């Protein structure tokens, strides 16, 4: 999250020299990014899907040899 670090750096550099106060802009941008962005459950689901796809491919290839 480079935005929070950049906001903290700007607030620390502009503590005494408050020429351009972008604290509100940074907070609004952070809130908007958090609203727009939206555990290992996804990884487990992906592993299960990969295993199921491998099983389906194996089952499809099991019916390759067929004479009559």
């Amino acid at each position: 999250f480079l935005p929070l670090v950049h906001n903290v750096i700007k607030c620390m550099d502009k503590d005494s020299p408050d020429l351009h106060q972008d604290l509100n802009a940074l907070k609004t941008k952070f809130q908007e990014l958090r609203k727009l962005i939206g555990p290992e459950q996804q990884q487990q689901q992906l592993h299960s899907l990969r295993e199921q796809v491998r099983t389906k491919n194996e089952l499809l290839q099991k019916y390759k040899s067929l004479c009559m």
């Binding site: 099983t55 389906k56 089952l59 019916y63 067929l66 009559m68």
Partner: protein
Amino acid sequence: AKDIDVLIDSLPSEESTAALQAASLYKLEEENHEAATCLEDVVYRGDMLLEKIQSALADIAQS
């Protein structure tokens, strides 16, 4: 009279006695037995093919 004579002349000249009809029936029975053996072999082959197809379908559905 002419029609009766022509019909009696052109009738089936065969099993009036008892040997020609018996020989024809025996030959027909032998031919039928051979044809039945051939048909049984063909039906066994077809049933084997159908059983193989059913086993393949069951294996595909088991996946």
